[PDB]
Design a protein around this nucleic acid. Structure first.
Ligand SMILES: NC(=O)c1ccc[n+]([C@@H]2O[C@H](COP(=O)([O-])OP(=O)(O)OC[C@H]3O[C@@H](n4cnc5c(N)ncnc54)[C@H](O)[C@@H]3O)[C@@H](O)[C@H]2O)c1
Ligand SMILES: NC(=O)c1ccc[n+]([C@@H]2O[C@H](COP(=O)([O-])OP(=O)(O)OC[C@H]3O[C@@H](n4cnc5c(N)ncnc54)[C@H](O)[C@@H]3O)[C@@H](O)[C@H]2O)c1
Ligand SMILES: NC(=O)c1ccc[n+]([C@@H]2O[C@H](COP(=O)([O-])OP(=O)(O)OC[C@H]3O[C@@H](n4cnc5c(N)ncnc54)[C@H](O)[C@@H]3O)[C@@H](O)[C@H]2O)c1
Ligand SMILES: NC(=O)c1ccc[n+]([C@@H]2O[C@H](COP(=O)([O-])OP(=O)(O)OC[C@H]3O[C@@H](n4cnc5c(N)ncnc54)[C@H](O)[C@@H]3O)[C@@H](O)[C@H]2O)c1
Ligand SMILES: [Mg+2]
Ligand SMILES: [Zn+2]
Lengths: 276, 255, 467, 255, 255, 255
RNA sequence: GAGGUAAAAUGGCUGAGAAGCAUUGGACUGUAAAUCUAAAGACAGGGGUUAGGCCUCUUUUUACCA
């Protein structure tokens, strides 16, 4: 009512606000504590609207604009082959853990972004020649991460060739085999060991309190390692923390007998100047 | 008809053997559940009725199988059918270059002894008691049905030993049929696909669901009652001899 | 343009300047520049008339808001009233800049009680800025309505907003007219707020305070602009300014809120392991209080041209000769011999001092803070670190200001810039610069208008008022 | 059970097809004998009962099979089972060096057209018919059972064309089983050996007796009733699909 | 060794036939490329030198094959080896319930007529030609090598007719070997998997990469040069007869 | 080519293994006979020359095979091919009613061990040995070639144990190929028919002459040199993997 | 294995100051599925702020002080 008129008067003045707003997101706006939070949420809605209408316009543009051996059924065949390899990985694949205990240290924005990165990481893993066997540890059934994952995967969640457990990776695997990957680790990863379970924190860190993964690894005595980014790259900008999908791609490249340069090809080019 | 016949089902306390025993005892036949003492054979035998008797035995052992056959003869006086549904499975790759792991020879030998040597032990010891039967009209004294697997034709990764044992059963099916044809015993083999039994408990549940979804039709795990139906059909068909039947729903396994 | 234009003039100007206009429309761009350069309201009115004529009497909201800005900047209340009527007629609710300009313009007119309604209308979705409250308070004070002014001030404080010094200056400037005890006590409340929140009046605000105090009946205040001598005594009278040392209750709560927050912030594994906490705590309670608490890695790393153990030994020996009881925090890797570190010099340190070595992955600074605080007020610590991060991880702002005061009082920083020169520490003031009372007397720092400051250093001038 | 099922038996006037029709009708099903005009199927259809109708048709042609299937739909309203039992036999050597004689291309063409092409024609039109049936509790719409020969595996001198056609049937059994899996139709094959029908009996009687003696066990020619029994077994077992069953008594042919 | 022999390759102007002709001419054997007039056989024959000749012909036509064999006699006076590689592929689903689409009988018939019937026509005529050869030391007169596919064993959706043709060739491989054993001619069959020929190389890059990844090892499409290698190995081994060899790299076709 | 390759031939002192060793050493390769101490492989290794060495081993025992592979690595530094030709044969009927005789479990166990378990033991140790090789272009590390008679498919009366062992080898050929595909090891199996070796000539001579007359073409028994030829062909073909080749001259055995 | 100061920060990757290439769930696709459909779009994270601008505190990165 009044709010939906303030937002229109801001739209008229050239402010970054959504053209159309709905009731649930109006409630979300009113749940923002301060003026700056309201401005940020409104800008987010505005850019969502821009991108949605741009892609819809592109949809309209696209709409306006013998002896064979195989029927063209290629996508289904690829999916089924990936499923066979995923089952084989479940049986004889190397474990790769994703710790889901950071749900307390994340607000909604970074929780949703974490879910997106998890989806992309799993997608990259499925396509590989020798997939890992993935674990989602400390994933609480009633948690927010579980809800978002069962909302993004939908009815594929129960058909996913990975282990989802509400227990800890210190209970599923031997304590001495676990290596916990974190950028704050004093120790560096010289080589990829094939007998070690690697634990990646499903955590987009946008808090100003650093070293949470290291605290988790210390509370339960575990080995820690970090990628040798500084040794192999001329870092210029950006934090050393990499997205989960980049981490899994690097680990997959290393797993399939890849050198460190080929593996680190997945580090963003904007963050480093070149290779050494 | 199976009415009045006596059947010796090895590994009859669980899964496919138990289903076959249930169907046969429901059709009026008598059943001997030859199985390990550790299994729940006693409870199943009591449940089935007075026509079912449990024999604690190890198919790998000559003395145990001889004692079980003696019990069957004493109780019912003869043996008419022998079902070999006793076996074990293992999941180990021949060699793993990344992990530097090699298949254990004891694992291979254990699987080969239980699956392949126990079947032959039962076959050879049961042919003796079948030979004592007077030929029926047509000259048939008994029927032997062995359980192979589809791993004998397309085995999976980490299924080398199991595939070897099942391929051995498939290979010896016909030579034994020719051996026993002079005296009138039919030797048959069944190669089931994926069936819902305790044997599949080792696999992860999601892997089992994927494999069930990969069966062309019906897209589900097999039902032991269906294996029992095929067993009865083989028992009642005089002209089925020395052949392997794939009860797998048209599934062809992939690596 | 500098003079009102005709419609044809506007059209030819549009044709010429559409080249420069760029992305936005001509009229919006031209009025934007006019607002930027403060054009007279007649030119803008002519532009709006031309736009409306072209657009069948409809002038966009943005243009009308920029025209409102122009006619509020030039203190033209009549056009502000007319624009207010236009806004009421055409739109049922306005935008916060529109509301802000309307409030800023309407405080002067007779229809100044409507600006309060506009403020309430803003309050629906957003918290009004400090300036909206400032303008409403000034409008209420100009019309001899003090109850509403204090209500608005109290609402401002209720929304956890820091009032702009102009508003407090306005209260003090208007106070001269009234002779009432309640108003005087409320002004003293404003002074106490200044004291609590570490804010310093501006030079004009200082003069306003001085005049108000001098105007009080019965008690003949005397005001002076003075400075404080190094010994913590202002030149005006010689009385001693308040001490920089913390009050006992404040010191206790700061010990508590540092232990429970900076060290074991509900985790007890982030900074250090529980074993190290227990070990350090036992070690501290074993030794009687200390006089200095050195940070080994900070004082060793100062000069890259000297070995770390060498610098540590030099500093420790120079502090030892003074008969001070030392405490050398550090890390375990300091003990193991290296090129940088040598056992001979570390043994000299452990005979001259009393050391404590933590894990190489643990954080030293919190141990430094707690050792110093546990020792007592007389204790001091040697470090060049400013400890911004540890101050950040404190619950509220009051605790952070307490920490900053204690740090000023008790921190020693090596100003020395070459190994050979003698050890000298940056000066530590003995008194705190803050609005303060001594019964009758009032001492109030302030900032000189034609200077610049930093949040590091604190005002030098003072205003001394004696009853 | 087969009670209430509607079956279309190709070549059902005589031989294995007639036996299958007799058994299915006796068990409670309904039968359509899809056969040639001069096969004499009208008399057999009258003999079986009111539940058996005779459809004249030549599997080699679309029109005849379509008319027969329309007749079946009109008479019974559903098609649940199909049994391809029509075929011909030809004996001729690829090349006689002594006699300077070469196999005839027309013999190969006609054998291939009847055994292999007609089977596909029937399969595809009957699959179109079954696609209209409501899925059963198991999702099944029908079953197709082709007839092959052990000549598909161990053919004999002079059986180049017969072996070619039967091997084609055996080869295409699985592709079709995968094609029709989404619909719910099960496709199976039976490969009999030396059954007592006019096709075999047309050989020299001495050869008939010798072949009867060659069978390991039972040492006789097959009984079409046993073929019908196996057909019913395949019908009643949900989990048999895309498989070839050898109903031959363990016989392997010699050159 | 193949030095001095005369080979007749059907479909010799492209793919596997061209690779076989290339290898055999390189090793010293004369070659005749029996192929359609519209293909590029003439250019390939010119490239291969004077030891290679091109014969326009249709394997489905008897007169064309007879003329090609007469040309081979005229040019080289003898026929020692025959390689049947000429065939077409057709992909078409047996029945599509959602689309209401049925397989076309003309597609099935043309696939059969080219592959299976042309293979048999060439086999019989070239056997008649080889019969005129004087026996070699060891009693051999010639060798015939047919091409098949793994579709004959496991066929993918839409490969009913192609699977039927390949399975027919596989089925008739042994009967013809037994027929021609008195004459002294060996008959063998090769079952390629996925090979880099114009059938596959024309497909998009993504699907080519997928198919290459499907092969267990080597994880690439086959090279016709090593099909020619296998053909030469068959020619050089006197004791390989009446057998099917799978040159597929361990790939089992997915449903 | 095979020049420079290191081949470990089990049972290389006699028959097929010896022929393979001779051919490979004559083609420029190196050979490590792996046989029992009493076989007499020292003399044959001396006869071949300085590219052949002898290793006393019992494939049934892990330590002996490990020592033999260590000897091979020390002598030549690398293992490229492994030809598994060791085996024993037993002729006993499962049960004899007239004679009242039963197959002994000891004979079955002995044959099974030596043929199947020893083959698996050698395969699993040589896979670890070959894992050390650097892949060549194409990614190939090694080749393993097992021997498994045609008794795996059709076994004669009295070959129950031999048929079981060879069927086991044939059954596990593909699982092991899929297991070792990532490593880049090709696993192939040869299935010879009747060959002229001590094993064959042991049994009554006129029976052997009859059996030779039963081979369609060439009638004469197989020649071990031709087994060696086929082994070399398998070594030289990159795309042969996971297949069983029958080298028997088209003979199908009879009861 | 510690600090001070100043510039920088795109959480799938490139950009522009727009946009392309990707990602997730569905579609048994007749060979441009080179598709069609839904899902996800916060330029480091918090507070403020101008007529238009941009400031401020934390975290991180880099380069200097050296
Ligand atoms: N999915 C399947 O179940 C499946 C698929 C293919 C083949 N098979 C074969 O079917 C047979 C039975 O399958 P199942 O699912 O019923 O198995 P199961 O694991 O349920 O059978 C358990 C039974 O086996 C008996 N047993 C095992 N080893 C024995 C031994 N050495 N001596 C005596 N008894 C022994 C146990 O006592 C118990 O009664 C096995 O040969 C199996 O390999 C089964
Ligand atoms: N010994 C055996 O009976 C034996 C062995 C192997 C395979 N088979 C196969 O079993 C099937 C049944 O044969 P059978 O034993 O009944 O022999 P049969 O000779 O009695 O079969 C004759 C039947 O085929 C029908 N028929 C032939 N060509 C036809 C056509 N073009 N259209 C329609 N109907 C046609 C006739 O009308 C008649 O019903 C055949 O496919 C046969 O090849 C039989
Ligand atoms: N990937 C593969 O190449 C592959 C896989 C399995 C099976 N096959 C089979 O291998 C054989 C050859 O495969 P290819 O890739 O070399 O094929 P291709 O398509 O490259 O062969 C083309 C040649 O076939 C000839 N040809 C086609 N039909 C003919 C006819 N009726 N009469 C005469 N000549 C005719 C053409 O004239 C031409 O020379 C075919 O039977 C094919 O189905 C090949
Ligand atoms: N006619 C045939 O020769 C024929 C037919 C089919 C299959 N085969 C198979 O071919 C292989 C070899 O045939 P062959 O004619 O050379 O047989 P053979 O009997 O001549 O082979 C004897 C060799 O086997 C070795 N051997 C046996 N057991 C051994 C063990 N446990 N450890 C080590 N060495 C052992 C002996 O030392 C000797 O070198 C066997 O697997 C056989 O079954 C042969
Ligand atoms: Mg610090
Ligand atoms: Zn004073």
């Amino acid at each position: 009512a009044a709010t939906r008129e303030f937002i229109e008067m801001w739209r008229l003045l050239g402010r970054e606000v959504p053209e159309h707003i709905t009731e649930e997101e109006l409630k979300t706006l009113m749940e923002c504590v301060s003026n700056t939070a309201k401005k940020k949420y409104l800008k987010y809605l505005y850019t969502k609207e821009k991108v949605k209408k741009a892609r819809q316009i592109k949809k309209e543009m696209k709409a306006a604009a013998k002896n064979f051996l195989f029927l063209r059924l290629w996508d289904r065949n690829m999916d089924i082959a990936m499923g066979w390899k995923g089952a084989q990985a479940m049986q004889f694949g190397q474990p790769l853990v994703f710790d889901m205990a950071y749900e307390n240290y994340m607000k909604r924005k970074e929780l949703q972004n974490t879910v997106s990165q998890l989806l992309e990481s799993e997608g990259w893993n499925r396509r590989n020649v020798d997939p890992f066997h993935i674990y989602f540890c400390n994933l609480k059934i009633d948690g927010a991460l579980h809800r978002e994952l069962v909302k993004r995967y939908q009815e594929k969640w129960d058909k996913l060739l990975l282990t989802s457990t509400e227990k800890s990776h210190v209970d599923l695997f031997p304590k001495d085999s676990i290596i916990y990957l974190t950028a704050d680790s004093p120790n560096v990863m010289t080589t990829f060991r094939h007998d070690k379970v690697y634990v990646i924190g499903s955590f987009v860190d946008k808090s100003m309190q650093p070293g949470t993964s290291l605290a988790k690894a210390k509370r339960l005595n575990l080995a820690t390692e970090c990628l040798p980014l500084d040794k192999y790259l001329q870092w210029e900008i950006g934090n050393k923390n990499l997205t989960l999908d980049q981490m899994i791609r690097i680990l997959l490249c290393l797993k399939n007998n890849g050198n460190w340069q080929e593996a680190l090809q997945f580090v963003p080019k904007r963050k480093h100047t070149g290779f050494l | 008809s199976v009415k009045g016949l006596v059947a010796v089902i090895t590994g009859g306390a669980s899964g496919l053997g138990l289903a076959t025993a249930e169907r046969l005892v429901g059709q009026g036949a008598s059943a001997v559940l030859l199985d390990l003492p550790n299994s729940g054979g006693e409870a199943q035998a009591k449940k089935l009725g007075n026509n079912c008797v449990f024999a604690p035995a190890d198919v790998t052992s000559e003395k145990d199988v001889q004692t079980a056959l003696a019990l069957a003869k004493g109780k019912f006086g003869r043996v008419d059918v022998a079902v070999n549904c006793a076996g074990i499975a293992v999941a180990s790759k021949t060699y793993n270059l990344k992990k530097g792991q090699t298949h254990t020879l004891e694992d291979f030998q254990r699987v080969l002894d239980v699956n392949l040597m126990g079947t032959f032990n039962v076959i050879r010891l049961v042919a003796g008691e079948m030979g004592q039967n007077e030929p029926d009209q047509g000259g048939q004294r008994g029927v032997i049905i062995n359980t192979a697997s589809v791993a004998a034709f397309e085995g999976q990764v980490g299924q080398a030993a199991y595939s070897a044992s099942k391929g051995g059963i498939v290979g010896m099916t016909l030579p034994i049929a020719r051996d026993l044809a002079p005296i009138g015993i039919r030797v048959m083999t069944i190669a089931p696909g994926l069936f819902g039994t305790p044997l599949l408990t080792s696999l992860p549940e999601k892997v089992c669901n994927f494999l069930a979804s990969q069966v062309p039709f019906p897209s589900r795990l097999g039902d032991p009652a269906e294996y029992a139906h095929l067993v009865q059909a083989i028992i009642e068909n005089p002209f089925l001899n020395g052949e392997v039947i794939r009860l797998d729903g048209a599934i062809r396994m992939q690596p | 343009p500098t003079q009102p234009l005709n419609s044809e003039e506007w059209d030819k100007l549009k044709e010429d300047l559409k080249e420069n206009t760029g992305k936005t429309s001509f009229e919006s761009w031209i009025i934007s520049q006019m607002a930027g350069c403060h054009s007279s309201i007649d030119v803008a009115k002519s532009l709006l008339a031309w736009v409306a004529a072209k657009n069948n009497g409809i002038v966009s909201y943005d243009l009308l808001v920029k025209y409102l800005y122009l006619c509020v900047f030039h203190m033209q209340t009549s056009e502000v009233i007319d624009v207010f009527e236009i806004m009421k007629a055409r739109y049922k609710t306005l935008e916060p800049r529109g509301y802000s300009l309307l409030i800023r313009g309407l405080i002067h007119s007779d229809r100044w009680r409507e600006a309060l309604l506009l403020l309430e209308d803003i309050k629906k979705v957003i918290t009004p800025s400090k300036k909206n409250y400032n303008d409403c308070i000034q409008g209420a004070l100009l019309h001899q309505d003090v109850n509403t002014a204090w209500n608005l001030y109290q609402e401002l404080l209720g929304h956890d907003i820091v009032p702009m010094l102009e508003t407090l200056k306005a209260f003090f400037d208007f106070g001269k007219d009234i002779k009432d005890d309640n108003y005087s006590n409320k002004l003293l409340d404003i002074l106490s707020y200044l004291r609590n929140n570490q804010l310093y009046p501006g030079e004009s605000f200082a003069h306003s305070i001085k005049t108000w105090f001098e105007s009080v009946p019965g008690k003949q205040w005397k005001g002076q602009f003075t400075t404080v001598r190094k010994s913590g005594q202002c030149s005006g009278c010689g009385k001693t300014i308040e001490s920089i040392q913390l009050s006992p209750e404040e010191y206790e709560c700061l010990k508590g809120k540092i232990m429970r927050d900076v060290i074991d912030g509900g985790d007890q594994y982030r900074k250090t392991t529980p074993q190290e906490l227990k070990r350090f705590e036992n070690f501290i309670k074993s030794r009687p209080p200390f006089d200095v608490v050195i940070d080994g890695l900070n004082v060793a790393k100062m000069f890259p041209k000297v070995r770390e153990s060498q610098l540590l030994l030099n500093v420790v020996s120079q502090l030892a000769k003074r008969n001070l009881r030392l405490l050398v925090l550090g890390r375990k890797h300091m003990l193991r011999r290296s090129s940088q570190w040598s056992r001979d010099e570390m043994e000299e340190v452990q005979k001259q001092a009393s050391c404590f070595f933590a894990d190489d992955i643990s954080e030293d600074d919190p141990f430094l803070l707690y050792a110093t605080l546990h020792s007592g007020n007389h204790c001091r610590f040697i470090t060049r670190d400013l400890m911004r991060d540890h101050k950040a991880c404190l619950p509220d702002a009051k605790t952070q200001r307490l920490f900053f005061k204690w740090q000023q009082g008790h921190q020693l920083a090596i100003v020395n810039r070459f190994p050979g020169s003698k050890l000298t520490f940056q000066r530590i003031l003995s008194y705190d610069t803050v609005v303060q009372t001594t019964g009758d007397s009032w001492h109030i720092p302030y900032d000189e208008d034609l200077v610049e400051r930093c949040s590091c250093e604190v005002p030098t001038k003072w205003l001394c008022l004696h009853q």
